[PDB]
Amino acid sequence: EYDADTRLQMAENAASARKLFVSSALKDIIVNPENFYHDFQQSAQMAEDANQRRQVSYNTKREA
C-alpha cells in the first residue's frame, strides 16, 4: 500500500486536474478505508462454481 498521506495527495492531484475537489466523504474513505474486498467472488471459487453448474446440468439426466 501507499500510506494514507500519499493516497490523499494523489487524490488531491487527481481532483484539481479536472477542476474537482476531494470531498469530506472521499477523504474519509482514503484515511480510514472500509474493507470491501471481494472475498465471496474470488476467481478460483467463481470459476469452479460456474464449471460445477455446466458439468452438473448436462451430464446429469432429468426425468420429468
Partner 1 sequence: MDVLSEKIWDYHNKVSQTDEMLQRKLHLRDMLYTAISPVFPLSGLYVVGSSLNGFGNNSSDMDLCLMITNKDLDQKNDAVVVLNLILSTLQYEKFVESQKLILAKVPILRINFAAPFDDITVDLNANNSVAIRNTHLLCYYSSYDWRVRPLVSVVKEWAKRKGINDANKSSFTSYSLVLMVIHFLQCGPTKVLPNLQQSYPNRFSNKVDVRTLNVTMALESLSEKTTLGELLIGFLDYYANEFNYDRDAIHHSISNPHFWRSQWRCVCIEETAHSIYDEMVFEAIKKAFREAHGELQHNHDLDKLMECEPIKA
**Contact positions toward partner 1, by CB under 8 A?**
1-2, 7, 10-11, 13-15, 17-18, 20-23, 25-26, 29, 33-41, 43, 45-47, 49-51, 53-54, 57-58, 62, 64
Cell for 59?
451430464
CB of 60 to partner 1, least distance (A): 10
Residues with their C more than 2.5 Å from the N of the next written residue in the chain, i.e. before a break, are none
Cell for 48?
469452479
CB of 18 to partner 1, least distance (A): 6
Nearer to partner 1, 5 or 33 (CB): 33
Q: Which of 54, 52, 32, 50 is nearest to 41 (CA)?
A: 50
